Structure 1
Amino acid sequence: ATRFASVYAWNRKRISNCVADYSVLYNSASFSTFKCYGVSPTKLNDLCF
């Protein structure tokens, strides 16, 4: 996205009825921090929500 929301008014987008590929995100290596709670980053791609 070109412009992000102010943290006091943080934006939320629902993701549903779609197939994900979290490996594309995690393997991008473009992120300085990537921390997951209660779900493993690698197994995240082998699960449904």
Structure 2
Amino acid sequence: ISNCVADYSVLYNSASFSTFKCYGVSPTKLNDLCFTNVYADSFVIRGDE
């Protein structure tokens, strides 16, 4: 993912998810930063994993 203007509040305000868990940042501050390169990864696992 590159060369965008990404909104992030359209994601976590939508209550689709049961696990939102950010590590180096906080989700409030994500509408204020600039990220230099963004990668996204996708897979499907079981419940407890």
TM-score (norm 2): 0.67
Calculate percent identity across the aligned residue pairs. Answer: 100
Q: Specify which structure has the bigger relative contact order, considering alpha-carbon pairs within 8 angstroms and separated by 6 or more residues.
A: 2
Listed as ranges, the gaps of 5+ residues in structure 2 are: 36-49
Aligned length: 35
Moved over 6 A (4+): none
1:41 maps to which of 19, 22, 27: 27
TM-score (norm 1): 0.67
Listed as ranges, the gaps of 5+ residues in structure 1 are: 1-14
Structure richer in helix, relative to its length: 1
Structure richer in strand, relative to its length: 2
CA RMSD, 1 decimal: 0.6
